[PDB]
Design an enzyme around this catalytic site. Structure first.
Site, PDB file in Angstrom:
ATOM      1  N   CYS A  79       0.116   3.904   2.684  1.00 58.30           N
ATOM      2  CA  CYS A  79       0.568   3.391   3.977  1.00 58.30           C
ATOM      3  C   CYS A  79       2.043   3.666   4.161  1.00 58.30           C
ATOM      4  O   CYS A  79       2.489   4.064   5.236  1.00 58.30           O
ATOM      5  CB  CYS A  79       0.355   1.876   4.077  1.00 58.30           C
ATOM      6  N   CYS A 129       0.806  -1.206   0.000  1.00 59.88           N
ATOM      7  CA  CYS A 129       0.000   0.000   0.000  1.00 59.88           C
ATOM      8  C   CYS A 129       0.849   1.271   0.000  1.00 59.88           C
ATOM      9  O   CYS A 129       1.548   1.571   0.969  1.00 59.88           O
ATOM     10  CB  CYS A 129      -0.957  -0.079   1.198  1.00 59.88           C
TER      11      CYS A 129
END
Length: 106
Positions: A34, A31
């Site tokens: 993230c 991600c």
């Protein structure tokens, strides 16, 4: 330094129940957002070292927990106070918002 704590089904509940303020950064290595949020989450966790627990829950290894709290998008930062969820922040949280939230609950 890294003062964040890895959470799994093994310690999730006891950590939330026995600490006044516990944050949970739900993430995954694949991600992009993230990855950009991680250093900010770590930086704030260091600022509040010893005062609140900054947990990290990798969603691919904790599917049931992610599902339990309906984590459909990541990153998501769950916020627990006195053992109960008081907020869930979706997307990389601005540092000011993250520090402001912590201060508010401490």
């Amino acid at each position: 330094e890294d003062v964040t704590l890895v959470l799994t089904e093994e310690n999730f509940d006891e950590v939330i129940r026995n600490n006044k303020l516990v944050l949970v950064d739900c993430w995954a290595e694949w991600c992009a957002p993230c990855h950009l949020y991680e250093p900010i989450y770590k930086k704030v966790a260091e600022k509040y070292k010893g005062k609140a627990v900054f947990g990290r829950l990798n969603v691919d290894e904790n599917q049931k927990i992610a599902d339990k709290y309906s984590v459909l998008n990541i990153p998501t930062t769950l916020i627990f106070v006195n053992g109960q969820l008081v907020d869930s922040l979706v997307g990389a949280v601005d540092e000011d918002t993250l520090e402001s939230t912590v201060n508010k609950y401490l």
